[PDB]
Amino acid sequence: MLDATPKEIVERKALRINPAKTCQPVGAMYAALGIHNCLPHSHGSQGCCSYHRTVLSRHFKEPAMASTSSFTEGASVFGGGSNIKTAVKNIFSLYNPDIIAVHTTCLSETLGDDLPTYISQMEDAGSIPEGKLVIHTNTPSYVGSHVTGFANMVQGIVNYLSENTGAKNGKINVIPGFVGPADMREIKRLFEAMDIPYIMFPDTSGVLDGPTTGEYKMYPEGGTKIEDLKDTGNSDLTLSLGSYASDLGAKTLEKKCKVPFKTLRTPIGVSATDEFIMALSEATGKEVPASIEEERGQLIDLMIDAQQYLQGKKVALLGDPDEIIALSKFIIELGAIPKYVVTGTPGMKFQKEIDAMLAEAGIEGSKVKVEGDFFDVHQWIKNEGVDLLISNTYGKFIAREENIPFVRFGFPIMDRYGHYYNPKVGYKGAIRLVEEITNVILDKIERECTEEDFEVVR
Amino acid sequence: MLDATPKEIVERKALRINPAKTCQPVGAMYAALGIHNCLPHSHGSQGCCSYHRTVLSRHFKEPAMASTSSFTEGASVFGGGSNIKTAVKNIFSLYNPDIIAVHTTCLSETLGDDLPTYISQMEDAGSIPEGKLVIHTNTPSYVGSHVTGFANMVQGIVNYLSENTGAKNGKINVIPGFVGPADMREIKRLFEAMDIPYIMFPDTSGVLDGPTTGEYKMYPEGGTKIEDLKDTGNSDLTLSLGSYASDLGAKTLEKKCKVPFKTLRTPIGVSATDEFIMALSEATGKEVPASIEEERGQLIDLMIDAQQYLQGKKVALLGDPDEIIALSKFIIELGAIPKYVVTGTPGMKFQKEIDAMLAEAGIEGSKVKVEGDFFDVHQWIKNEGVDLLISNTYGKFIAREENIPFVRFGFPIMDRYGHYYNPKVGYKGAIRLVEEITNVILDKIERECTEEDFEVVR
Amino acid sequence: ENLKDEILEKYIPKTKKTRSGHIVIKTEETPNPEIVANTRTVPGIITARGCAYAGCKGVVMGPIKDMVHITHGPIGCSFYTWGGRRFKSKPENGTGLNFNEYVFSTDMQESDIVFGGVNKLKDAIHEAYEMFHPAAIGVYATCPVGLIGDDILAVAATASKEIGIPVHAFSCEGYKGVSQSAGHHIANNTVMTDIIGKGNKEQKKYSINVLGEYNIGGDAWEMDRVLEKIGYHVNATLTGDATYEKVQNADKADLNLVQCHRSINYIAEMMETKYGIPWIKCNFIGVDGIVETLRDMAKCFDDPELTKRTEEVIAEEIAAIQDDLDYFKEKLQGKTACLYVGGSRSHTYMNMLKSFGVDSLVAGFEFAHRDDYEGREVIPTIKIDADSKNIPEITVTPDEQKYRVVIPEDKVEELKKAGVPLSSYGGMMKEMHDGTILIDDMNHHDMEVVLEKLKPDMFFAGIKEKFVIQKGGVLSKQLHSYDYNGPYAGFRGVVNFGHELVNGIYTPAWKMITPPWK
Amino acid sequence: ENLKDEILEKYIPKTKKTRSGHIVIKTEETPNPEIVANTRTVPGIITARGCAYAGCKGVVMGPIKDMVHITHGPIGCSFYTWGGRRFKSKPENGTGLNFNEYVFSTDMQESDIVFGGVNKLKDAIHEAYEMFHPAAIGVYATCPVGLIGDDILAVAATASKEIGIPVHAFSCEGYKGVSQSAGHHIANNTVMTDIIGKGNKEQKKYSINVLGEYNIGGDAWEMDRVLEKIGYHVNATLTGDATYEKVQNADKADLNLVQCHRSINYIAEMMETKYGIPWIKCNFIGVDGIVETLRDMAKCFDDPELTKRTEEVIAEEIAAIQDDLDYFKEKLQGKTACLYVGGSRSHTYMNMLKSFGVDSLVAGFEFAHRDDYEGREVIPTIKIDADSKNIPEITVTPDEQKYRVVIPEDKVEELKKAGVPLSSYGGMMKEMHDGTILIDDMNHHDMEVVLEKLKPDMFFAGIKEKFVIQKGGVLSKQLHSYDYNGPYAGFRGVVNFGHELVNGIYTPAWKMITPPWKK
């Protein structure tokens, strides 16, 4: 499998192979589905919209609705203004969202389409019904990755909606980053256990992890409500979880509405979850309750109980920067080694943070690469093997070829059922991760050992 | 592996091989650990106590404390009265439990030791300090299984503690059966979501799934408090979850304290969880909240999303009767087939219930056996294979020899880390089961398929 | 007062007026209504359609397994072609190259947009050549490419000289045309002129090609199994499990079999013009489809041994599965279905459903043309639409050295009057029964009205519709991805399809949706 | 004032008095204190001890892989011997029988208790024979068996005559004696008289047996690898990975090596008396232990080629691991340990810890006797205790046909003077340094006082103690089960053990126990 990948490395400067990212717009689409009664709108050629809706359905095994401007060759000459104006008329009439959240594509960005002007022209024409909203962001796919698209859409939410009206709400805003609905649920559960009022946005819980009830509901029950999105400007503080996905929105809200913010790691593992809980306690004066302390102590108990199977294990990790920074720290906390650590999303922070935690732990000889791909990691593995691989579905090819215990993590995970009901954040998510990691390690040991070395207890 | 097991089926009449049960006392020990500040006491030769404590630590990766009478050959002659009287003096002085919960062994039962007399003699001697308690049950290991031992200890709790004082508490008692601490936590969570006051007993949550805090605490935080065990006589109703484990206690409480009871299946899967939630609503007039309804609908969503990998799958199941009855129903609900269904625990109920659900589903050609063992099931598999095996750790030998996807379930599970944090009951536990089942089925497909048949999406 | 009226009701007036033509009801009175197809998508309507790049790179070209396919664009165009379309490939002869597990991109960045991307494209072609030494390289345009000034034709021609293997450029920018269809046409043009007929292989006896077959879920291997058993040489399949060299030698055949009309009819027509090779419409899906196809082939070759072997193989294949066939009909008869796929499968799966006793009430295509709906006889009447007018048309002429008369005109006329579909395709509508409805570019709104009014037992579509339909308690099986199963073509495919369909219908959870407290 | 006083303080007067003798401190002034050992367990004290059935079936006999071992009892006695003790087995020569993966029992029910269990036992023996055709069948008593009147000796004898293979009964009811120890003795008696010397194999050159070695985690295979490289014939290991036939031919050796003194010394003594075969105490755990053992063996054989190969193999084995050994010492030196195991390993693991720079401050055994603590020289002074007096003693005499002089008397005396432990064992206390404490039948109370007062870096014990110790933030590695690793014996075992130990100490989570919202 992957037979064409050589052991001997010739460094590529132009040919991208098996990327560890996708493009901005699906991140903006995902963020928009975290708004209640929102139809995401893809302003470009319809291929984009179809592909982006499709990956969400493949990952979540759920519907994922979005409209498109359906550019033609004419639009490629005259711009997409006529298309989006037509689209909005059809969307409100046929599908009646409360808000259309527009993002763009490489096509409309190359063309320089002026969304603010189109939207003002829509309003002037009466195309936006009373009580309805159209918002936008710009998501050029030749910049950044899907993480950047998410970040941009959150900025667009703030730009259009957040308002400081002087009516303090006593809440903390939380921007959870590009994490799954189960992670959003777990973060909300922790706020609630701390007894801290909050506004989470975006929030895809109850949108991309919903029930079957026998009736299809185009706009699921979940998502942050428009009125609460407006009210984010009346909050005390914003917690930005994962700088790549969340800081742009947090900083925009500070500038617009004078809401201060604090940047935190995505809360995966011991220190990152601890830092999140401490930030909550420090911001509010609220004590950490026994239930949360119990969960942390159960995680520590599990880390110690399972320790022998973790110490010194070499791990290859690929994924999105916020999650992989925090997961790498957790790998170190477990006594294991982040050996090969890659993201396809550009930016210096990943490099700095990963390098710093490796140095603190005294770990030499790891490879950390920004704008690396799955081809890179496979080549590295051919030169020095690893004990564990953690990535999205596309790692499965390497795992099979190289016989490496494999943990599905991040996005997209398109080949298993129910993963989207499990958090990876918090003490609870950390417990699940340790179980999964040790299960796959032990499964391999027990499949491959000689019969005489087979064990009852482990 | 298991090379001595032939294909040609033998109907053994005397030699038990690779049993699907263990003896009563560990079940009583487990129940006793579900009482706060209780030290279980094994009245017999100390080998029993050591073995029974050991299996609990191997399963939970936790301490499991118990004292023993440490019979010698002298006891085998004069009985164990002197031993238990000496034991109680050392237990209260050194270890200061609030309650000693005594169970017996085949040795003390063969000898006919008279626990009520010994306990009355300790009181007369002044060996039981003020405010402290000694209770007992009788747990002959030649009767029943560890499930029966659990049931008997619950009866002992009722016999000594439960009292109707005329002061109605407005609560429902729940006897959760021989289920793990995670299942106890989930059942409590459901009562709390329903807003129904309750007393659960035994309750090993916070006892056999506890945190590491840096100080060893002999009596962990969890366990039902003695005052609440007394107060069970003042409740409105007892729900007995799992007739084998729980009915004896529920019936004893009805006779002693006039608290009516209702028997329910262990709540695994759709109908069995539905029946539990409906019993709660009917008993209290309380409506089912949206959160519980969402969980059910997510389970249905998952059953439908994952359906193709489940339909017609042949399953071999071994374990304890309450859990295997309910799991077998869930297998049918998933569209799969309980092909081989075995418990080591005696009793006709299992046979009747399993046979009846197979008949309702039109399923012919399955083998259901009470007092069958892992050797039986292996022989059956050699004659007609299966697609899935669900059992405790000891199924792993069959899973490897026959190359069957394997789900660890029940007791003891001694070879994985963190399993004891996941419930199998409720809609939440059902979701986890479907994920685990489909994961192991898909793992085999993707390991064994040809390269050209390897898939991205599943 | 009918279902068409009910679908149309909620549209705003401008949209209603344009959508009306896309929906027709077949009746006894008027069995062949004209439909509007292959026009622009209405913005905002929630279409299932994709783009020209999908049709060219993702669909027609990608399955060629020993060609390195480089997407010239930002990353998503590449990422979204990484394994989602299930063409199966294996190393040819156990040893040949296979790039199915990879996607290759120039990963365009801001500076490529501002200054052009031709330097990075050249460098990527050379890196791919040096690393992989493939049979050929393809370069596929995406949305920004034309607009930023990149001449990929010139870059490809330069690179091909500098590396010594073929490099083929495809101007399949996603906004071109109105759907995946333009991408088919763009692929076919370059395949025809630059690949087909470039080989040197000696033609074998009883040589056929399967055109417009992409080996989704192993379909092509299953049809080859049966064809080879009868005695045909399967010279090439365009393009499922194809090697580049087999495409180059596609002219070494006596008969082209057209499975997917929409995607490959361009090449079928041009091979007949240039080489004299006749084509027949085939359908290897469903027992009736397969049997008819094999008998039509036998009539074309008119070889006594081939005719006998055809009947022998048919009889043995059917005998092996008849118990399964009987079971599907028992379990499914009387149930109703809707079918909505891209350009072919809404039609080709109909005979199988009919054999199972399932009544197909609704069918449509994302992007098929009037000829796929109404038959090729309407081609002279098709109006040239402004939104596809710039898709290039190429013309071929007989190759003076290679052209041959394969089937003489007298025999051709005889075969056609006998019902053999030589250079013809009757279209989907003809196969549907009276009082059924056709919906071109069916959107979410349309689908919901159909579901509410007709209450079908099953609705076959794709991944975007599947869970929408199933949230409402109706089974939806995917006719693109096969729900990660296959083959669904051929005799073994009928069995695979039928068991999956029965398993879907009889899944117990469909009856558990309502909780007992409601 | 001292740690013994601190341990004793909380006991009630009766218990204090009896426990005091089980705890002794070795000092420069009194380096060889007498201990009390092998007495009854105090009821209610929270002991780690097991029963005589464990010692007989679970420990000594179970490892014989081509014998079907039938527990005559209710189900737990059988279930709790299903794989928890990690003796490893493989089919002999790739083809022989192996029942390691199975447990067998009569699954006694109330009817058997009320009416007798002998017919079910007979029927189970016949089912085992007809299904498995093993080399032999064992029948093991459990708590109810004698009390209900079942004569398993008679059942076995009747069955053996019918089926034509040996059937061996063991009256190892759990309440006999005070611990696992009685079960060892009961097993040894029947193995000696009814198994050993029943074979007819031709003795090979340089033949040794390893006695009291059970191949936990592969230990015996690792010993054997090195012994066979030097040139010994490993005639039998009692009982790790053993076939029944090898035990039958245990008399076909020139030297017995005693690894576990407690469990097998009975057979070592009896083989010397009956056959003339000498024994030496051996210790194949730790580099220093192994090296000394191999050098003692070479002294006994006094063969120039064996001696030469001994030194070549020692040098090559050590060279291959010296970098690991250096790392263990670097990472562990200066740390402190406690050891609490059953009857041997508290002692045999000491030299390895000492080589790593670890200071063993506390050691004890569950069930060892005074000779294991103080050395065999104290045997004549050991008082016969009432709770073990009915464990049978058998006597053997020189076999008039098979007895032979292996090492002449004058040479034995010369070898002893030279330090070779012929028919001797110095005991654990001798090896411990001054100021250390020994605790016999250490209970939970005692252990908690030790942990609080001494704050050791690590505490080696078993599964019941492990998590108690680790909940308190102290590493506990299991010296019975090896935490599901091994071999820990032999040269490769030092490396396995050391890496596991370093990995345990340096696990990061130990430093993460206090949450940041607390001091």
Ligand code: ICS
């Ligand atoms: S090529 Fe076409 S949409 Fe004919 S673009 Fe599409 S692998 Fe469909 S109905 Mo996906 S004209 Fe093929 C098709 Fe049919 S990708 Fe496949 S299933 S038979």
Ligand code: ICS
């Ligand atoms: S036989 Fe004994 S308790 Fe010597 S009963 Fe026990 S496999 Fe221990 S210290 Mo478990 S006298 Fe062996 C023993 Fe040592 S079971 Fe093992 S580790 S060396």
Ligand code: CLF
């Ligand atoms: S209609 Fe088609 S798929 Fe769309 S871009 Fe255009 S050729 Fe491509 Fe590629 S990178 Fe992402 S998915 Fe687009 S927004 Fe820029």
Ligand code: CLF
């Ligand atoms: S001290 Fe030892 S292990 Fe205990 S019984 Fe006695 S021989 Fe056996 Fe077997 S069945 Fe269970 S574990 Fe006992 S209580 Fe009856």
Ligand SMILES: [Fe+2]
């Ligand atoms: Fe879903």
Ligand SMILES: [Fe+2]
């Ligand atoms: Fe634990």
